[PDB]
Design a protein around this nucleic acid. Structure first.
Lengths: 126, 182, 263
RNA sequence: CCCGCCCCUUGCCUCUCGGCGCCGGCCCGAAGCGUUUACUUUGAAAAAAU
RNA sequence: GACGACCCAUUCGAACGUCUGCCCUAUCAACUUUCGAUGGUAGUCGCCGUGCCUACCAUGGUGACCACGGGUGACGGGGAAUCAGGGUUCGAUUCCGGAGAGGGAGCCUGAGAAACGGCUACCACAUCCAAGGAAGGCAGCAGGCGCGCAAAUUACCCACUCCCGACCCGGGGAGGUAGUGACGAAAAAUAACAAUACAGGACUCUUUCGAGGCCCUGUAAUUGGAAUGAGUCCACUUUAAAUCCUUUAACGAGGAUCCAUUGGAGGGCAAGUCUGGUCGCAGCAGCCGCGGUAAUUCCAGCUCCAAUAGCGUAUAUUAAAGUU
RNA sequence: UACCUGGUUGAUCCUGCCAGUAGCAUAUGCUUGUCUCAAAGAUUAAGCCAUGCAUGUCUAAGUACGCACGGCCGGUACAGUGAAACUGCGAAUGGCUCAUUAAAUCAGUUAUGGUUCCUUUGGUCGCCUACUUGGAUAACUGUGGUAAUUC
């Protein structure tokens, strides 16, 4: 609706190759706009294009009319792709990890203890 | 982790005189329950307990000065005490009614639109008022002294600017779709 | 459980002056073994994500240390729980910055940025003199460095300036009255004042009076005293407040006097 | 109710080694302690949470 | 650069030792000694100090200021509940220290273990078997049986917090997340406002009579306009993924439903000599007492009072107790 | 909130207990619309246990003739990735319970000049073979045994 993104705690984080600030948002219509919409606007406030913007947080204050999150802006793609928590890259896809998970792993391990010299056999058994 | 019990119960369970005071006090401010009264009276007796310490110990000991100053500052900040008083003796002149005056529902009634105290509590809960910019649902706020002139209706709500309610907006459509031709 | 040494450290028995919370989980970092005493350390990760907020998770700090931007005393360290303590210099060369670990007047390790010029040395207390084999003497310091062939006139409770690169001390002070001191242990911490007097007993500790230039006298055990420079002449850049230490009444008064809590 | 005075006043000396003095000579701080305790008053010293 | 190794220092500790501090019992007053009790001399052993152990020698040690013996529904402490002052009671349980993995004993490896998700044996249990043999220890997380007055899901996941490894990369029922949850704690919904209708009293006018008129009240009849979340529910958001919450469409209130109960009404002690039934029967009653034909106490109805999303009942314990 | 009230008598004043009163924590009854915080097989049987799971681990840098994959061109020590296996490190941390345990444990205070210490950090690191010495084990290959096992 009415979208106001206002700049607060600007820091140039040279070690991780990013710029981290707070994402302070005002909007008296329906508070809370999609995170996709936010990173478009922030892309065209430092002119860095939306493949290195990352945002998260965004809890909306009581009574609405404000929401506050936390956003990073990376210098390049590869610096984001390296550093970035795994789930945050997979949040808007360019990464994934297949997870079976966590009963298929354990049940394979305990079957593997019984054999020796062949690791592929128990996996082949389905 | 950490919790505490705010209210306390009366020592005697029945006593006509006590009960009448609790009743007439609730009538005046439009409170819901007696647990909402004893809560207040705990706060008063708590402040009176802290105070009774500081009066015994000579002046110009660091404990008495620093504590007293910051205690009295807080009593002045809510405005249940004058700065024409501001001595530790005047802490003891405090009483129940001055607290209850600073409550939000009392100040809604006193400095804003209501028709009775009973009206004003409902307005706070149905979210038609704010305190500076911020909606509240708490008629038990206690209202700092400076902020007793920033009580306003909500910036979106049928009272002041904002969309019409669903009793109004129903009946508006009742002239065209409720009795307009069907 | 006591069939060997423990490896976990909780949060709720953690040394309190790292200013930890308690709504994050049960464990706290634990200093790993090193040159400074466990209580007197500030683990690395607490400087880098619970102070200056470069990182936000512990995994992020590991990702900084791996690329080796961190140094301590001019050498490269790469643990997340390296146990740095009093009088060391951290050096990030990818920002051009240098820090120093020194005590605030409220007794906690502050951020005291400094010139690169100052960041080429540190102040080290002498604790033991020990003749090794073949008539060679030694020093032993609180940062646990063994510097061979010291000139003989340096005694314990003295302090020595050490060149991080080469050892081989540049100067020293000889402990006495009318020398400027900092407190490093005890219930007094970070206070600065001249020595004024000493007192000796035969065994069972001894104490050392101190007096500052604001007219207050206080005392501390011998082994909590550290020399910083000649009388009223620090050889280090000191953090604000200058070790004087106010009471709480006066400290309150300053904040409401300037009427300032933001800027 | 901190120096001293009547006889006492933080009881003494003895001195000697490393500072302060004044003009070789002389003066006064630190060194042994006031028969012993309790008591009282001040410091040091003390994990966090509560 | 990586790795390894010797010694010293350091760090993390570990182990012995000092002084002081402990619940009940005298229907427990003497105890301890070559099956070392206390001390001396030398040695053995052990990481080291030491009757720790051995030889020889001495004859001591402790106690009415409570030893020794017995008891404990006794793990210790940081603490918790109540309380004017002084106290009393509790502490299995998140921090710190200790002890133990069915009961006992022995032992390997290692820097570190008298280890039990290591080993060996006995004793107590219990399983498979082709009866020749083999294998086992949930006071780890779930779950089951049993015991009882009495206690949850065979769920999701290494994202957080940290730990472990040769290691940025792997792993972790530690730990984080959800479910069950009226132990307990915080917040506070169950109707607010006008019209008519009667009703009151200040007020005014009037000689009283009477009228006007104002302030409020309930109370009936309908209503009238207004308001909102409870719910239903697209969407954003939340997060490892999701739920919840906050944020937002559209639907969502006329008192009959989008229904507040738990106890009591003789005295203690706030509240009825109302009506019907029962008639020392049945029952009530912490206590004092009610019931034998007019029941203020029983069984019901009506009405009223207290507390209010809570209230009653049993038991431990403190205050009340200047009745320790 | 430094507090009392009913009951021995025909009546009164005492002594004294009983009952009433309030909090706390366990059980239990009846009732329950929304929100945040969260204790939970201790009390009795430190009784007994099906099933599943709760400790593993590799960098350019200890050891790659997996006949695995790959190559492009191979081998001069000789690639790149890499299951397996030897080797190194850990399993002595955590978690759980409260049975034993009355100067014991434990708490405050002190001592190792009476001692040990993986590891980290800092020093210590020159009285017919050396162009590099010796010979076996696993994975692997192939052949088996038991009713049955991580033999």
């Amino acid at each position: 609706d009415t979208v106001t993104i206002r700049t607060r705690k600007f820091m140039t984080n040279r070690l991780l190759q990013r710029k981290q600030m707070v994402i302070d948002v005002l909007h008296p219509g329906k508070a809370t706009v999609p995170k996709t919409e936010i990173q478009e606007k922030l892309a065209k406030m430092y002119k860095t294009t939306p493949d290195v913007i990352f945002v998260f947080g965004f809890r909306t204050h009581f009574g609405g009319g404000k929401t506050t999150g936390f956003g990073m802006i990376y210098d390049s793609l590869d610096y984001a792709k390296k550093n970035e928590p795994k789930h945050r890259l997979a949040r808007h896809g360019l990464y994934e990890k297949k997870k079976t998970s966590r009963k298929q792993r354990k049940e394979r391990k305990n079957r593997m203890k019984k054999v020796r010299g062949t690791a592929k056999a128990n996996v082949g058994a389905g | 982790w950490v919790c505490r019990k705010t209210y306390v119960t009366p020592r005697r369970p029945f006593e006509k005189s006590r009960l009448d005071q609790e009743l007439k006090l609730i009538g005046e401010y439009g409170l819901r329950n007696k647990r909402e009264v004893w809560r207040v009276k705990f706060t008063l007796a708590k402040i009176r307990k802290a105070a009774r310490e500081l009066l015994t110990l000579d002046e110009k000991d660091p404990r008495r000065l620093f504590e007293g100053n910051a205690l009295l500052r807080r009593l002045v900040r809510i405005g249940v005490l004058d700065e024409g008083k501001m001595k530790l003796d005047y802490i003891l002149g405090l009483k129940i009614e001055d607290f209850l005056e600073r409550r939000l529902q009392t100040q809604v009634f006193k400095l804003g639109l209501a028709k009775s105290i009973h009206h004003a509590r409902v307005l706070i809960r149905q979210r038609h008022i704010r305190v500076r910019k911020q909606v509240v649902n708490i008629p038990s706020f206690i209202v700092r002294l400076d902020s007793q002139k920033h009580i306003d209706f909500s910036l979106r709500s049928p009272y002041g600017g904002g969309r019409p309610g669903r009793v109004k907006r129903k009946n508006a459509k009742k002239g065209q779709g409720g009795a307009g031709a069907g | 459980m006591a069939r060997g040494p423990k490896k976990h450290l909780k949060r709720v028995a953690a040394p309190k002056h790292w200013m930890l919370d308690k709504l994050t989980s049960v464990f706290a970092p634990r200093p790993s073994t090193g040159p400074h005493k466990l209580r007197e350390c500030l683990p690395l990760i607490i400087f880098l994500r619970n102070k200056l907020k470069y990182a936000l998770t512990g995994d992020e700090v590991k990702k900084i240390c791996m690329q080796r931007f961190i140094k301590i005393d001019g050498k490269v360290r790469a643990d997340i729980t390296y146990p740095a303590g009093f009088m060391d210099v951290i050096s990030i060369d990818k920002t051009g910055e240098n820090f120093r670990l020194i005590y605030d007047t409220k007794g906690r390790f502050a951020v005291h940025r400094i010139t690169p010029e100052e960041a080429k040395y540190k102040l080290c207390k002498v604790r033991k003199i020990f003749v090794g084999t073949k008539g060679i003497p030694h020093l032993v310091t609180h940062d646990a460095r063994t510097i061979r062939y010291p000139d003989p006139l340096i005694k314990m409770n003295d302090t020595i300036q050490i060149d991080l690169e080469t050892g081989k001390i540049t100067d020293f002070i000889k402990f006495d009255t009318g020398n400027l001191c900092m407190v490093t242990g005890g219930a007094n911490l970070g206070r600065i004042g001249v020595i004024t007097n000493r007192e000796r007993h035969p065994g069972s500790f001894d104490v050392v009076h101190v007096k500052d230039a604001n007219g207050n006298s206080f005392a501390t055990r011998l082994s909590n005293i550290f020399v910083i420079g000649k009388g009223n002449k620090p050889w280090i850049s000191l953090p604000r407040g200058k070790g004087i230490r106010l009471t709480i009444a006066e400290e309150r008064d300053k904040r409401l006097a300037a009427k300032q809590s933001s800027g």
